[PDB]
Nucleic acid binder design. Structure first.
Lengths: 168, 52, 324, 138, 118, 177
RNA sequence: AUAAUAAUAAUAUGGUAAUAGAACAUUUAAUGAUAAUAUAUAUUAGUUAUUAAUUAAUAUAUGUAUUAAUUAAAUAGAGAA
RNA sequence: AGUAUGAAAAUGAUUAUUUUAUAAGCAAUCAUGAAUAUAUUAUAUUAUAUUAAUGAUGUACCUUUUGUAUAAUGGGUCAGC
């Protein structure tokens, strides 16, 4: 309904942010960050359903919480407009949730330690196979096209300074 | 208090010291005056429509 | 009193100055003077003429002003006189550039292929290059609004000194271009300005010193580096070379191994020379034999085409491109 | 068959016609502000006029602002040097201005030993080759 | 001195010396002298005098400062400037005093405008 | 030999075999004032230089023709032929008439699998290239061949495709000069 | 007869303990314009022979500088316990 | 142990760029390819920036000492004091 052409100019960051995503967040999980990492590294770039399945059949305690989070993120994506079979976990990390209560451990022979009690949160960003993954495939293709080939007897720069004199 | 005439070499010049506030006030008055002019014209047009 | 009335009369005065480009006002403009001094323009070229050269055509304000919602607002420039813009000048400058540059290229490389020559010409005087040159010179665009100028209360001299066309305010704000025509592009305006200056120079000097314009061009445009060897891209050069040899009084070209090392390795070196009789035409190194052969043919073709004769020689008119 | 590769020329400023690198200088000062005294004195005292007379290809803007006194140059390449001349005397300001006018606009940069000449041109003699050398290796 | 091949050749290089510092150049080349020129201002032209060698692809007229008459070699002074500012620190091995040796040497950008056999 | 200049290597004061990269030695080496002949230690592939262009490509009124600088160092008798066609070794033949050509064309359309280019060449004592120039095959056959080629390409791994791309890029680069 | 900067010549310009000289950052007091087109602060990219300041871009605040500058006071500067 | 605010650091996870599975040390500097990033005069054969190809040289700091890489001394690290 218009004869006006346009050209859009967007930063790399702007491109990244505007692709359809969904941002899951856990509640105050009772665990170490290290323990969370030990699981979360497995769920790196998986499809959300696959990740959920892995969490279900994992032996770890954080696993259930992670599964629940993934389920919530899927539900959010559905509400927005996205599909659950389209969603893959783009990023998933953990962090300290703060207010870890220290508590002295009394040892033998008038010695002591301090026992902290770590609480964490897992956040994750689900992105779409339909867009983000396609975009990065396209980028990879462009990079491949750009890539200058290996030339056998090719023009390499004569590195070093000339010194105001012909050496040949 | 330098001026462009003070230097007597035509590639030299002194930009006009008009305070930002004064400029803003001028802008406000002009755009306001335009708005007033427009509103009166619209009212007149409405009156003419009402008449016939 | 009213501030609107004061603004309106200022605008009217500015419009009148644009229409005239009165000489005294142009002289007063510091930017114009500095431009004149920078380029070492002739004293016969008046400051009014220089101001005019910076004035692009802008008779009527376009329909796209009606909506800044569609991503455009033209609020900087003021309407120009129909018979005092850079438009006629610009065309003349373009013609001069197309003549002189091309002639210089032909003098340099009398056998240069037609497509290659055209590319070289473009390189020397493309719109982007011309715009860059104008920027380098210091031809700045009138980006500031008329209202803003009035508020600052700056003279019309400064306006005259700047480049003047329908430059779209909010051109790429929020990363949104509108893709308008050539009559609203900055690069194009800058190109026109540099062509207009050349045309003005020509106009003033033609009767006294006819070649003044052409030496100015040589100084500014033809002084720029262009390796003509980087312009070429052959397809089946051996065949083309053979055709060339047939056309001239030369024996059939055959490629022969001069030197060889590292056969049966990742990166050998094969030197082959395309001989016509005992004379070698092209020398070609390569990782493969085929590659070396190809390179020898390409070298031969380069030597044929990019042959540059001396000024002392009588004119070399080539016998056309080698139609394979 | 032969085809062109679209390519653009490189401007060497010096060779045909020298365009002077410094195009515009802005003298900035404050009426209040004790750091702008030497700048103010310079502006007053017939030196600026002489300068402008000497260099009519540079335009010399003179601005008033609340902050420290400033010398911003503007070059042909599009870069902009800005020297703050806070608390400098007249002569120091003038020296700074001279330095600015001297500059080709390009960014400051570490040079290695003997990194002297910067050519666009292909070597007049070729690049060396072991097959084509005068003395063959063994 | 039969200087005919040099005169003929389209490509041509020079090895002129400023203060016994050699600089190998063609026309268009952009020499960067590592000092502040006092004599020449920006825009001034320098006629090179101590030219050691003048060379084609296969010939060269080399020797004591070759007769200037034989050639031309005009440089243009295209900007006095400086190197990037550096501050190396100078200190001994059990001494808290660390003297900063600030450095920002001067440069003079020349451009070889003309180079030809006269 | 027009010019009788003394000839010089690009001389170092140091041992050239051990210190060829040492610019200092080159800088040190002074030689007596005058004209010299320093033959270039380079191939003349990319050079548009006037001392590199051959005499046949120079114009008739060029002074440079007479001067001895496009040196014929190599000899065509000594060098052996590389990727040379059989026409170049034993001369081109223009023997086949119109009728023979028409017959060839008829054959090729009829059955390009049986009557392939090489077979035609063998029959008529002529080149496969010439056969191709003479006669188109049935477009169906061409389409089939294209489909086969596409299938082969698909059968590749990722690596092979990349290598082929690189090869193509190299080929393109060869013809630049 | 002074100063500021620039010239030409010469001489000097490593450094612990230590002596002397001269500067800068920070905070308060006296005097004190300016203004969210500003200021303050941060990152980055610049410029100034560069502990520093300044330009620009950007984020955040704040309708605003005890602000520039001259003094005078310092709880005036931390990889060393 | 006020109330805001808080891109202060140390520190955790993740990603992106880039490097890294034949190479041996204060981990840097300098040299130097290469890859990438950004760039409203990249005209470009451009610039800068990020980065452990690669080569050269390189025995933390401090105190205390006739003398320290020292296997003499102090410091886990950052912020405040």
């Amino acid at each position: 309904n218009s004869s006006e052409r346009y050209k859009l100019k967007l930063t790399k960051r702007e491109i990244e942010v505007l692709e359809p995503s969904v941002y899951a967040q856990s509640y105050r999980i009772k665990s170490s960050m290290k323990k969370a990492t030990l699981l979360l590294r497995l769920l790196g770039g998986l499809d959300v359903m696959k990740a959920i399945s892995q969490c279900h059949f994992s032996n770890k305690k954080i696993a259930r919480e992670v599964a629940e989070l993934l389920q919530k993120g899927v539900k959010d994506g559905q509400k927005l407009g996205l599909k659950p079979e389209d969603l893959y976990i783009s990023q998933i990390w953990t962090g300290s949730d703060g207010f870890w209560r220290k508590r002295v451990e009394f040892k033998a022979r008038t010695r002591i330690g301090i026992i902290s009690h770590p609480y964490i949160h897992v956040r994750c960003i689900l992105r779409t196979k339909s867009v983000t993954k396609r975009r990065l495939a396209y980028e990879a293709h462009l990079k491949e096209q750009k890539r200058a080939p290996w030339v056998q007897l090719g023009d390499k720069p004569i590195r070093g300074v000339t010194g105001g004199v012909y050496k040949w | 208090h330098p001026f462009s005439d003070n230097y007597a070499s035509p590639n030299i010049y002194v930009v006009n010291d008009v305070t930002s506030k004064e400029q803003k006030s001028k802008y406000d008055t002009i755009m306001k005056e335009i708005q007033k002019l427009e509103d009166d014209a619209t009212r007149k047009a409405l009156e003419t429509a009402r008449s016939a | 009193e009213s501030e609107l009335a004061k603004y309106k009369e200022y605008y009217q005065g500015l419009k009148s100055t644009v229409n005239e480009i009165p000489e005294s006002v142009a002289s007063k403009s510091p930017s114009l003077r500095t431009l004149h001094k920078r380029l070492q323009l002739p004293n016969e070229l008046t400051y009014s003429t220089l101001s005019r050269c910076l004035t692009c055509p802008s008779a009527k304000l376009p329909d796209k002003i009606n909506n800044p919602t569609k991503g455009a607002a033209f609020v900087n420039t003021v309407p120009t006189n129909k018979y005092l813009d850079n438009h006629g000048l610009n065309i003349m400058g373009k013609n001069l550039l197309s003549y002189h540059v091309t002639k210089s290229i032909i003098q340099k490389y009398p056998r240069l292929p037609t497509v290659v020559l055209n590319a070289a010409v473009n390189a020397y005087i493309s719109e982007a290059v011309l715009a860059h040159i104008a920027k380098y010179w210091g031809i700045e665009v009138e980006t500031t609004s008329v209202l803003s100028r009035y508020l600052k209360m700056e003279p019309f001299e400064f306006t005259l000194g700047r480049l003047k066309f329908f430059n779209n305010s909010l051109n790429s704000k929020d990363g949104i271009e509108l893709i308008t025509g050539k009559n609203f592009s900055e690069t194009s305006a800058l190109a026109m300005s540099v062509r207009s200056i050349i045309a003005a120079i020509w106009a003033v000097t033609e009767q006294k010193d006819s070649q003044a314009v052409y030496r100015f061009i040589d100084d500014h445009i033809m002084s720029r580096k262009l390796d003509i060897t980087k312009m070429f891209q052959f397809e089946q050069p051996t065949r083309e070379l053979a055709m060339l040899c047939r056309r001239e009084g030369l024996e059939k070209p055959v490629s022969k191994l001069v030197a060889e090392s590292g056969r049966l390795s990742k990166s050998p070196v094969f030197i082959v020379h395309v001989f016509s009789g005992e004379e070698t035409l092209g020398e070609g190194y390569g990782s493969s034999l085929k590659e070396a052969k190809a390179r020898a043919a390409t070298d031969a073709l380069m030597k044929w085409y990019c042959y540059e004769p001396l000024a002392q020689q009588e004119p070399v008119i080539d016998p056309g491109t080698v139609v394979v | 068959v032969v085809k062109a590769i679209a390519r653009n020329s490189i401007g060497r400023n010096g060779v045909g016609a020298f365009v002077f690198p410094c195009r515009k200088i802005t003298l900035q000062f404050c009426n209040w502000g004790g750091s702008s005294e030497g700048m103010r004195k310079f502006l007053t005292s017939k030196r600026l006029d002489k300068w402008g007379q000497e260099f009519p290809w540079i335009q010399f803007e003179v601005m008033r602002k609340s902050g420290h006194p400033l010398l911003r140059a503007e070059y042909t390449n599009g870069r902009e040097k800005v020297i703050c001349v806070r608390n400098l005397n007249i002569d120091n300001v003038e020296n700074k201005l001279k330095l600015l006018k001297d500059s080709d606009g390009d960014i400051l940069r570490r040079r290695t030993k003997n990194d002297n000449v910067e050519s666009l041109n292909s070597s007049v003699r070729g690049i060396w080759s072991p097959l084509h050398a005068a003395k063959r290796h063994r | 001195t039969d200087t005919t091949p040099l005169k003929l050749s389209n490509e041509l290089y020079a090895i002129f010396k400023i203060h016994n510092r050699p600089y190998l150049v063609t026309e268009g080349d952009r020499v960067i002298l590592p000092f502040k020129l006092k004599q020449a201002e920006v825009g001034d032209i320098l006629n090179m005098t101590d030219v050691t060698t003048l060379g084609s692809r296969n010939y060269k007229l080399v020797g004591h400062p070759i007769n200037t008459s034989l050639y031309t070699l005009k440089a243009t002074v295209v900007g006095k400037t400086k190197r990037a500012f550096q501050t190396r620190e100078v200190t001994k091995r059990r001494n808290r005093r660390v003297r900063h040796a600030k450095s920002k040497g001067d440069l003079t950008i020349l451009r070889i405008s003309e180079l030809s056999m006269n | 030999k027009q010019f009788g200049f003394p000839k010089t290597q690009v001389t170092t004061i140091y041992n050239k075999t051990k210190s060829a990269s040492n610019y200092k030695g080159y800088l040190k080496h002074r030689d007596a004032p005058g004209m010299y002949y320093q033959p270039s230690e380079s191939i003349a592939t990319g050079s548009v230089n006037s001392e590199t262009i051959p005499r046949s490509f120079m114009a008739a009124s060029d002074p440079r023709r007479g001067l001895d600088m496009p040196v014929q160092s190599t000899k065509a008798k000594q060098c052996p032929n590389v990727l040379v066609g059989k026409s170049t070794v034993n001369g081109k033949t223009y023997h086949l008439g119109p009728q023979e050509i028409d017959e060839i064309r008829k054959l090729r359309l009829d059955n390009p699998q049986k009557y392939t280019r090489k077979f035609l060449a063998a029959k008529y004592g002529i080149s496969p290239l010439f056969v191709s120039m003479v006669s188109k095959p049935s477009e169906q056959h061409v389409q089939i061949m294209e489909s086969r080629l596409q299938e082969i390409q698909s059968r590749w791994k990722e690596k092979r495709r990349i290598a082929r791309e690189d090869r193509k890029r190299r080929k393109l680069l060869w013809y630049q000069a």
